[PDB]
Swiss-Prot record:
Name of the gene encoding the protein in the UniProt record: RNT1
Species assigned in the record: Saccharomyces cerevisiae (strain ATCC 204508 / S288c) (Baker's yeast)
Residues of the full protein shown: 364 to 447 of 471
Cited function: DsRNA-specific nuclease that cleaves eukaryotic pre-ribosomal RNA at the U3 snoRNP-dependent A0 site in the 5'-external transcribed spacer (ETS) and in the 3'-ETS. In vitro, cleaves synthetic 5'-ETS RNA A0 site in the absence of snoRNA or other factors. Has an essential growth function in addition to pre-rRNA processing.
Miscellaneous remark of the record: Present with 4970 molecules/cell in log phase SD medium.
Protein name according to UniProt: Ribonuclease 3
Residues of the DRBM domain: 7-75
Length: 88
């Protein structure tokens, strides 16, 4: 079900996540007092956030972060030409 941005995460992994790019999401929100919402940062296997986006919860923020990564048509094309070209 919806919780870890299935479609969004599947999109990134299906468009750029080939292997070396361990598509992972690290939430730093921790709702309390200083944290106003659910902020997540999609980090690759190496060590670079490709998708950063906030949300109401881990589900929303997760979809927002992945969506932020999908927005980069240029960055998506570079990987899309590798992930899609690496497999078929």
């Amino acid at each position: 079900m919806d919780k870890l941005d299935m479609n969004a995460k599947r999109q990134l992994y299906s468009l750029i996540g080939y292997a070396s790019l361990r598509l992972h999401y690290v939430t730093v929100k921790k709702p309390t007092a200083v944290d106003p919402n659910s902020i997540v940062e999609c980090r690759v296997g190496d060590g670079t956030v490709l998708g950063t986006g906030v949300g109401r919860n881990i589900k929303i923020a997760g979809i927002r972060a992945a969506e932020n990564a999908l927005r980069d048509k240029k960055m998506l094309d570079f990987y899309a030409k590798q992930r899609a070209a690496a497999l078929g």
